[PDB]
Scaffold this active site. Structure first.
Site, PDB file in Angstrom:
ATOM      1  N   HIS A  92       0.865  -1.180   0.000  1.00  0.00           N
ATOM      2  CA  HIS A  92       0.000   0.000   0.000  1.00  0.00           C
ATOM      3  C   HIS A  92       0.916   1.250   0.000  1.00  0.00           C
ATOM      4  O   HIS A  92       2.100   1.078   0.163  1.00  0.00           O
ATOM      5  CB  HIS A  92      -1.001   0.051   1.149  1.00  0.00           C
ATOM      6  CG  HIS A  92      -0.225   0.020   2.415  1.00  0.00           C
ATOM      7  ND1 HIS A  92       0.174  -1.161   3.070  1.00  0.00           N
ATOM      8  CD2 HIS A  92       0.336   1.080   3.074  1.00  0.00           C
ATOM      9  CE1 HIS A  92       0.934  -0.765   4.112  1.00  0.00           C
ATOM     10  NE2 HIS A  92       0.992   0.554   4.048  1.00  0.00           N
ATOM     11  N   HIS A 117       4.833   0.876   0.895  1.00  0.00           N
ATOM     12  CA  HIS A 117       5.242  -0.173   1.867  1.00  0.00           C
ATOM     13  C   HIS A 117       4.898  -1.582   1.388  1.00  0.00           C
ATOM     14  O   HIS A 117       3.692  -1.780   1.058  1.00  0.00           O
ATOM     15  CB  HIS A 117       4.532   0.035   3.237  1.00  0.00           C
ATOM     16  CG  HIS A 117       4.986   1.289   3.939  1.00  0.00           C
ATOM     17  ND1 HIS A 117       4.284   1.991   4.884  1.00  0.00           N
ATOM     18  CD2 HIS A 117       6.161   1.985   3.801  1.00  0.00           C
ATOM     19  CE1 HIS A 117       4.946   3.071   5.293  1.00  0.00           C
ATOM     20  NE2 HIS A 117       6.108   3.068   4.671  1.00  0.00           N
ATOM     21  N   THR A 196       2.786   1.587  11.125  1.00  0.00           N
ATOM     22  CA  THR A 196       2.596   2.989  11.184  1.00  0.00           C
ATOM     23  C   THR A 196       1.137   3.395  11.325  1.00  0.00           C
ATOM     24  O   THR A 196       0.863   4.636  11.393  1.00  0.00           O
ATOM     25  CB  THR A 196       3.389   3.813  10.129  1.00  0.00           C
ATOM     26  OG1 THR A 196       2.655   3.616   8.903  1.00  0.00           O
ATOM     27  CG2 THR A 196       4.913   3.588  10.081  1.00  0.00           C
TER      28      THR A 196
HETATM   29 ZN   LIG Z   1       2.248   1.746   5.474  1.00  0.00          ZN
END
Ligand SMILES: [Zn+2]
Length: 258
Positions: A92, A117, A196
């Site tokens: 993503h 990522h 994150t």
């Molecule tokens: Zn991410």
């Protein structure tokens, strides 16, 4: 209410539902290039994505994920600072409302327009859900995007966004090759960190590539057309879905290069 990136439920509020938000090994971080330690014991990464099987693309309300078949060792990462094999589960992006922001990791405080990522889980744990509970459970490859020339390998993604405009929508997405998203060089920085987004678990070995890939302005413009909201709800554009840099605390960033 539920977390997001707005003024009322944004990263500054996450700690109230996910206390680990103020943990000791939170991501992203600023990568200080002059303080990163060159470590000659780090091996080159090994990316084997030739047997990758994409299945679907989904708008989950915070980003869009392209998902892969992880029932066998088809697309794996190994080497680098890793022990064992990590299977690709999904990729993503994080992006901004302007070209001057969007990345989560920063380099000498420079922010990029976006950050890709590629999420992998450690096969010794048998499934993704078990891997996130371990300190060495995930390996994430972070790739910066700058605005310049178009990236041909990203166009198939760009083109399907119209069909997953709002939260919860998904579309079949087979035969996508993630090799078209890698820079030429695999030089990287590495450190121990976390997811994150909530639940912010500290289970990630981050592998951040030194070389950004370029995307065109029009490519990133299509990302900004997505919605955070569900169909038939008031329209909130999906932009600025990035968490700011967190304190490094007791951590060292290692470089695979000098
Ligand atoms: Zn991410």
């Amino acid at each position: 209410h539920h977390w997001g990136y707005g003024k009322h439920n944004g990263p500054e509020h996450w700690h109230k539902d996910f206390p680990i938000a103020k943990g000791e090994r939170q991501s992203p971080v600023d990568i200080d290039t002059h303080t990163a330690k060159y470590d000659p014991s780090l091996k080159p990464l090994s990316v084997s994505y030739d047997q990758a099987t994409s299945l679907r693309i989904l708008n989950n309300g915070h980003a869009f994920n392209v998902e892969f078949d992880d029932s066998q060792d088809k697309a794996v990462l190994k080497g680098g600072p890793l022990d064992g094999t990590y299977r690709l589960i999904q990729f993503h992006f994080h992006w901004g409302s302007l070209d001057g922001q969007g990345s989560e990791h920063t380099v000498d405080k420079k922010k990029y327009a976006a950050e890709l990522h590629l999420v992998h889980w450690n096969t010794k744990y048998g499934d993704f859900g078990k891997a996130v509970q371990q300190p060495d459970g995930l390996a994430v490859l972070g790739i910066f995007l700058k605005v310049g020339s178009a990236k041909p390998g990203l166009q198939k993604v760009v083109d399907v966004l119209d069909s997953i405009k709002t939260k919860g929508k998904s579309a079949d997405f087979t035969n996508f090759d993630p090799r078209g998203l890698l820079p030429e060089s695999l030089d990287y920085w590495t450190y121990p960190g976390s997811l994150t987004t909530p639940p912010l678990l500290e289970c990630v070995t981050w592998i951040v590539l030194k070389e950004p890939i370029s995307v065109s302005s029009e490519q990133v413009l299509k990302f900004r057309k997505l919605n955070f909201n569900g169909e038939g709800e008031p329209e909130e554009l999906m932009v600025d879905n990035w968490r700011p840099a967190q304190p490094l605390k007791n951590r060292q960033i290692k470089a695979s290069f000098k």
